Ligand binder design. Structure first.
Ligand SMILES: [Mg+2]
Ligand SMILES: [Zn+2]
Ligand SMILES: [Zn+2]
Lengths: 1358, 49
DNA sequence: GTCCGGCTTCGCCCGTAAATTCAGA
DNA sequence: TCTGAATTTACGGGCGCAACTATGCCGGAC
RNA sequence: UGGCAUAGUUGC
């Protein structure tokens, strides 16, 4: 039918061509007879018959008159469907300016005339005059005349002179412009100019003019002369209860535009005075602006009930507009909804569907079966049979439900597992029975949740449900490799109880002949489920070429473990069920079964696990009482010690030794330490609570306490909630992420008196507000991620690229979080991994790193592997399978076609929203660390330092004077075993390259203050400081000394704004003491609110803290506060204090030092010497006058802008930075996301590139074009003898990247529909609808899944 | 001695919805909130109990 | 009952264009 | 007295998904 | 016989 959508300005001729008749009267319905008016908004001769194949007056009422037009009224007898698509038009009495192109910001009309928006607004709405064809007068072209100026011109320039007013003047100006001539002058002026802002304005004007010239548009069409009118059925009048019709919004706007138009026409007919017609023209312009986009100009006109009318712009844009309400998501037939229940008896592939919804959904199928079997000849008979619910239609329903999957969907479909297909089982009830295992995927508890059933209709849809969306195919989460059908809470508790041991139970020590004997003994009551015994176990190992080899032995086990072993399939080892089998153990068990055996064994194993866990949890009778929350006996003394600590800190504060912020931080930290101690004591008293013996001496064992038995097993809860139950429940956090320094000293078993139950409500309000108010942030972020990455689909199998990224184990400053096993799993290597010993190819170049390869890497102890990344793929319009890697939903490589962009967006967006809505699961307790203050090495090994510039103080202790010092504990084999972050101003017990042993500290500092340690010795001078506005000095009269605090930019006086307090180290003679072998003074700048305890001219030594700045508090560190960091990362926000990097390498030299803005210069060996940088002198510089620098090296410290990283260090550097930064946030919250998703998102961010040299291509000089287009153009050019155009990649935010797309439909459906549509119309854009969103909107096969083959065939058969 | 006033009753900090929850002090404040909101929705049965 | 018409402010964040203020020649 | 860069100010867009119940829906001349 | 507004509520 079609393959592209063309958008352009609608000329008046085109508008007339669309319309089938002018609308003249502002009347819709007679309101006595419901017939349409003669030629009103609702008309029959203009828009078509009201009834199908019936004339208005009834002259013709049959198909035999299909086409003829009645002469009595003039209605073309035809169907009413045409009335849905027949447009009208209104002949505006005067030209009217289209508001979109006037207030698009930028304004198309404004900068096409090179006129500011305020003045064109003044001219349009009849408040000033604008000259047209000034000629040989004292007037310019765009100059403006008010009433006084116009009078002066008229009385003084009554000769040939034209100064019109209103939209007519703007139309005349538009029509009197030669686009190509203006392009010539603007371009030749651009080449002949020198400024930069004017350069940007001129190039924007040139771009708009060239867009107009290239497209078929004309400027004057931007001013409406003929106004289109929407077909009536799209603005229907639907009767309301009573005679009154629905108070439609478009009808009112259209009907008060016809009013003004008719009034103005009547006034111009009789030549009314200029003022009255002028005011009428202004009112007409306002009415048309309100109709096109109400409220954009201001004074949003409101109808009855004072609600602004929904204009056309309001109908096509916004969350309630067509794109996001009727085209990207629609209501669907064959769908029902109902509450969900458990139904444990179900298998993983089936769901319990109520008989009533089953009958109601499958009505057409039942009709078809009834007709086929001859029980109802006519469809009326079949419908009657179905509605009576006869005894025979139920049999039909069972016969038609057999192999017909139904989609089950829960409301917040955060990720793709929120909609899964199940085989229906007819249930006698009104609630859908949902399998327990899939609940975790759905996040579907059974406390009132409702789910929706959809019925696939066509054979293709049924097979897609059966082969792609069946719950027995979604064993592994698409975000990571971990299983998603892991048993949640009851099954894991049952398995934990079953697989466990106690020192003395019934039937202990006896030797069993097999698992069957164990079950017989347990059921017979002769042996306890948990009693140590010996069992003859036969386990199958398939280390052969796929052959299962039996192995019989006598395992020391328990009765319960042996019983459970009967459920494990053959190929698994026995040790897999020889542990306590917590939740993580069961998850690993299922994962190993999947990787070793396959899918069907895993599904059967999961079903059997669920059944046996439920059965034995029921048998265990594991209940909860009030005597199970045992209170520790150490709680009171810990509380007393913490209270003594806060009392002493308060005493110090009242003496002025500490300020309020650091006192608050210290109180928070000591209370957190006390809470951790109480929790530790509680768990110690709880886990070993039971000591049991009846055969000799006492033997401690892990307790059978219900609370502990459920916490350890991972069934429900964690350390935090059990802590709140038994131990002190600690600090709370206010909704604004502020921690209430007053703790709660009582647990939940004890009281929580009135005052304590008032601090708690702050945290409870925080938790519930973050669920209902801050979930919009996660939803917005995931929508942006999806809409930036939706067209990215796997196309090829291998691009043959040798580029990649170096994946290494991540140690952010503690121990290993994600080892190399989990960072390179299921990703294709880039280069051969040589053996660590000597240049031996350990893995080939293009082998997928599955479990065996990763274990080989582990046993060979590899530290870094280069793997192919999505961001470094040489494929145009997609990603080859190899650079992506493992599917992460199946165990194989990504299939050719699967849409990885949407999967990545969902994977990155789902955990944020889920944790945002789960924040209320810990009440409101603040998650806090001990604030470190030291670095305790755990393992023996050498110590090395990176990014370190330290100095030795008086006491010989090495002090770190660098910001980003990394202390690495290296092993004797050269492998970095641990990493640590050393803050600026830490004291190191040991040094660089020095051996250490475990358990001894190597660094210590004060976390609550940032010191300003020096580099040399001398005396202190308060240079460039004045008391009163530069610092606030506090006098200590009784002691005789004084202190002072630097007051930040907020507090200091505007007069003398730029006064910089600094501590300048000077020699005894009074001259600055230069730092070792440099050419600049050793002066240290004091930032705001810096506490100086020194006095002017006081002796100091090297490595001494001149001043200490309070570090300010950090509130609750949960997802709610960390998600903004992820959003900023993916939006590519420039930090407030970006680190300045070196554009080019070479030698460094300081230049003029002009005005306190010191100039840096980098002179390469033989390249472009005169490169220069403007560096403010108030910020520190790492490099000074002496040394080499590589490009991308830090000249100063601070956060690094991702744009700088991309420009200097390259694509791999910026993608690694983004991956690590977002993964830090998601690791803090315990979220497991594979780096593939972040890497593909980063790719979608850096999808544009700006040309620097046109080369031999046809691109402009500095335009921005798709990286793929420029790359393919360069490839084609180098195929011949020409040379391609050099480019520079750009990093764009997800919002900007999504909006700046070749297709205007995808951007229009996204934010800024008005702006996107305006730019597309002006530029005359053409959309090939080659993405996913466009194909969804249009309503054709998606080019991602099964439709990928169809789209490829269509491209071949273009 | 400095005490100028005393709370008249221990219930005065809550409303008539949360004051009907026995052992409120042992419930997490969120769960007290939900308990009150759900008492507001209970349907009258055939016979009171 | 049947027919006809044009007084509310009070949110948080960020991107981008226009206006201002330096900082010079 | 002019002119470019950087800074400030003004102003337009964004602010998750799904679901259920109830009431009210225009004010002024012949 | 389908639309908008306001209020309340459920699951996240
Ligand atoms: Mg629920
Ligand atoms: Zn007729
Ligand atoms: Zn590739």
């Amino acid at each position: 039918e079609f393959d592209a959508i063309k958008i352009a300005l609608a000329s008046p001729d085109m508008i007339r061509s669309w319309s089938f008749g002018e609308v003249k009267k502002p009347e819709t319905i007679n309101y006595r007879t419901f017939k349409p008016e003669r030629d009103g908004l609702f008309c029959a001769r203009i828009f078509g018959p009201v009834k199908d194949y019936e004339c208005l007056c009834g002259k013709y009422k049959r198909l035999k008159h299909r086409g003829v037009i009645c002469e009595k009224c003039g209605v073309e007898v035809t169907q009413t469907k045409v009335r849905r698509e027949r447009m009208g038009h209104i002949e505006l009495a005067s030209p009217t300016a289209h508001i979109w192109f006037l207030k698009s910001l930028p304004s198309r009309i404004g900068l096409l005339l090179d006129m500011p928006l305020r003045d064109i607004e003044r001219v349009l709405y009849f408040e000033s005059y604008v000259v047209i064809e000034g000629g040989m007068t004292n007037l310019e072209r765009q100059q403006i005349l008010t009433e006084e100026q116009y009078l002066d011109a008229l009385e003084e320039f009554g000769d040939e002179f034209d100064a019109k007013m209103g939209a007519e003047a703007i139309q005349a100006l538009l029509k009197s412009m030669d686009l190509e001539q203006e392009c010539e002058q603007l371009r030749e002026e651009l080449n002949e100019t020198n400024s930069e802002t004017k350069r940007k304005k001129l190039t924007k004007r040139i771009k708009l003019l060239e867009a107009f010239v290239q497209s078929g548009n004309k400027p004057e069409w931007m001013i409406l002369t003929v106004l289109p009118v929407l077909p009536p059925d799209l603005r229907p009048l639907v009767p309301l209860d009573g005679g009154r019709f629905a108070t439609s919004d478009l009808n009112d706007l259209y009907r008060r535009v016809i009013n003004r138009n008719n009034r103005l026409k009547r006034l111009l007919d009789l030549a009314a005075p200029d003022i009255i017609v002028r005011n009428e023209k202004r009112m007409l312009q306002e009415a048309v602006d309100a109709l096109l986009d109400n409220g954009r100009r201001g004074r949003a006109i409101t109808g009855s009930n004072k609600r602004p009318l929904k204009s056309l712009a309001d109908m096509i844009k916004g969350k309630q507009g067509r794109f996001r309400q009727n085209l990207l998501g629609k209501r669907v037939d064959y769908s029902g909804r109902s509450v969900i229940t458990v139904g444990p008896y179900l298998r993983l592939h089936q769901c319990g569907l109520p008989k009533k919804m089953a009958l109601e959904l499958f009505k057409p199928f039942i009709y078809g079966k009834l007709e086929l079997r001859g029980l109802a000849t006519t469809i009326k008979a079949a419908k009657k049979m179905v509605e009576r619910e006869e005894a025979v239609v139920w049999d039909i329903l069972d016969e038609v439900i057999r192999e017909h999957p139904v989609l089950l969907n829960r409301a917040p479909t955060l990720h793709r597992l929120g909609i899964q297909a199940f085989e229906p089982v007819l249930i006698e009830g009104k609630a859908i029975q949902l399998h327990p295992l899939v609940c975790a995927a759905y996040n579907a508890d059974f406390d009132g949740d409702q789910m929706a059933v959809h019925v696939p209709l066509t054979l293709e849809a049924q097979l897609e449900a059966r082969a792609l969306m069946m719950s027995t195919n979604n064993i592994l989460s698409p975000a990571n490799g971990e299983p998603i059908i892991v048993p949640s809470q009851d099954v894991v508790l049952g398995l934990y109880y079953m697989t466990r041991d106690c020192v003395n139970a019934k039937g202990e020590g006896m030797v069993l002949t097999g698992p069957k004997e164990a079950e017989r003994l347990y059921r017979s009551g002769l042996a306890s489920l948990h009693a140590r015994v010996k069992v003859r176990i036969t386990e199958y190992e398939k280390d052969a070429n796929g052959e299962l080899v039996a192995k019989t032995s006598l395992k020391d086990t328990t009765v319960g473990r042996a019983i459970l072993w009967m459920i494990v399939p053959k190929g698994l080892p026995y040790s897999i069920v020889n542990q306590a089998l917590g939740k993580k153990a069961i998850s690993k068990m299922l994962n190993t079964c999947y990787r070793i055996l396959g899918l069907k064994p895993t599904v059967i194993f999961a079903d059997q696990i669920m059944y046996t866990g439920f059965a034995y949890a029921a048998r265990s009778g594991a209940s909860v009482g009030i005597d199970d929350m045992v209170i520790p006996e150490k709680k009171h003394e810990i509380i007393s010690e913490a209270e003594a600590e806060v009392a002493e800190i308060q005493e110090q504060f009242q003496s002025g030794l500490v300020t309020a912020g650091e006192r608050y931080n210290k109180v928070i930290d000591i209370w957190a330490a006390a809470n951790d101690r109480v929790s530790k004591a509680m768990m110690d008293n709880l886990q070993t609570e039971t000591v049991i013996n009846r055969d000799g001496q006492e033997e401690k064992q892990v307790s059978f306490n219900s609370i502990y038995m459920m916490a350890d097993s991972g069934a429900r809860g964690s350390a935090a909630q059990i802590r709140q139950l038994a131990g002190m429940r600690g600090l709370m956090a206010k909704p604004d992420g502020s921690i209430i320094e007053t703790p709660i000293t009582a647990n939940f078993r004890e009281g929580l008196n009135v005052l304590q139950y008032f601090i708690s409500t702050h945290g409870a309000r925080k938790g519930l507000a973050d669920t209902a108010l801050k979930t919009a942030n996660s939803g917005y972020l995931t929508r942006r991620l999806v809409d930036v990455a939706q067209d990215l689909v796997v196309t090829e199998d291998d691009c043959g690229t040798h580029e990649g990224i170096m994946m290494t184990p991540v140690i952010e400053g503690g121990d290993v979080k994600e080892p190399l096993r989990d960072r390179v799993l299921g990703r294709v290597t880039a280069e051969d991994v040589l053996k660590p010993g000597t240049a031996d190819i350990l893995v080939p170049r293009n082998t997928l790193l599955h479990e065996q390869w990763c274990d080989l890497l582990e046993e060979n102890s590899v530290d870094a592997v280069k793997v192919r990344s999505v961001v470094s793929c040489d494929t145009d319009f997609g990603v080859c399978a190899h650079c992506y890697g493992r599917d992460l939903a199946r165990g194989h490589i990504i299939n050719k076609g699967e849409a990885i962009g949407v999967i990545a967006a969902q994977s990155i967006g789902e955990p944020g929203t889920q944790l945002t809505m789960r924040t209320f699961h810990i009440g409101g307790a603040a998650s806090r660390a001990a604030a470190e203050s030291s670095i305790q090495v755990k393992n023996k090994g050498s110590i090395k330092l990176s990014n370190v510039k330290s100095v030795v103080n008086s006491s010989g202790k090495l002090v770190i004077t660098s910001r980003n010092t990394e202390l690495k504990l290296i092993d004797e084999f050269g492998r970095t075993k641990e990493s640590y972050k050393v803050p600026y101003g830490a004291v190191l017990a040991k040094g660089d390259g020095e051996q250490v042993a475990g358990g001894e500290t190597v660094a210590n500092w004060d976390p609550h203050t940032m010191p300003v340690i020096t580099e040399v010795s001398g005396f202190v001078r308060f240079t460039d400081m004045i008391d009163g506005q530069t610092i606030t000095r506090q006098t200590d009269e009784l002691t005789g000394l004084s202190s002072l605090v630097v007051l930040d930019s907020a507090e200091r006086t505007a007069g003398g704004k730029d006064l910089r307090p600094a501590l300048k180290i000077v020699d005894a003679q009074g001259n600055d003491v230069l730092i070792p072998g440099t050419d600049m003074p050793a002066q240290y700048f004091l930032p705001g609110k810096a506490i100086v305890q020194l006095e002017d001219g006081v002796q100091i030594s090297s490595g001494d803290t001149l001043a200490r700045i309070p570090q300010e508090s950090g509130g609750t560190k949960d997802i709610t506060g960390g998600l903004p960091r992820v959003a900023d990362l993916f939006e590519a926000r420039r930090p407030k204090e970006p680190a300045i990097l070196a554009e080019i390498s070479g030698i460094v030299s300081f230049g003029k030092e002009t005005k306190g803005k010191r100039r840096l210069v980098i002179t390469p060996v033989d390249g472009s010497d005169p490169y220069e940088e403007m560096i403010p002198k108030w910020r520190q510089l790492n490099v000074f006058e002496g040394e080499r620098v590589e490009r991308g090296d830090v000249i100063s410290d601070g956060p690094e802008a991702p744009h700088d990283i991309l420009r200097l260090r390259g694509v791999h550097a910026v993608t690694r930075y983004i991956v690590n930064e977002v993964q830090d946030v998601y690791r803090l919250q315990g979220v497991k996301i594979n780096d593939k998703h972040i890497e593909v998102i980063v790719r979608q961010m850096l999808r544009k590139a700006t040309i620097v040299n046109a080369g031999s291509s046809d691109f402009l000089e500095g335009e921005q074009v798709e990286y793929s287009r420029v790359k393919i153009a360069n490839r084609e050019l180098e195929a011949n003898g020409k040379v391609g155009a050099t480019y520079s990649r750009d990093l764009l935010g997800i919002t900007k990247a999504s909006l700046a797309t070749e297709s205007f439909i995808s951007a229009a459906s996204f934010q800024e529909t008005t702006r996107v549509l305006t730019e597309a119309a002006v530029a005359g854009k053409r959309d090939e609808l080659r993405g996913l969103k466009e194909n969804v909107i249009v309503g054709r096969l998606i080019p991602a899944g099964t439709g990928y083959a169809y789209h490829q065939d269509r491209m071949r058969r273009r | 001695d400095q005490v100028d006033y005393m709370d008249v009753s221990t219930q005065q900090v809550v409303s008539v919805g949360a004051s009907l929850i026995p052992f409120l002090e042992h419930d997490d404040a969120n769960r007290a909130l939900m308990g009150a909101n759900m008492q507001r929705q209970a349907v009258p049965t055939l016979r009171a109990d």
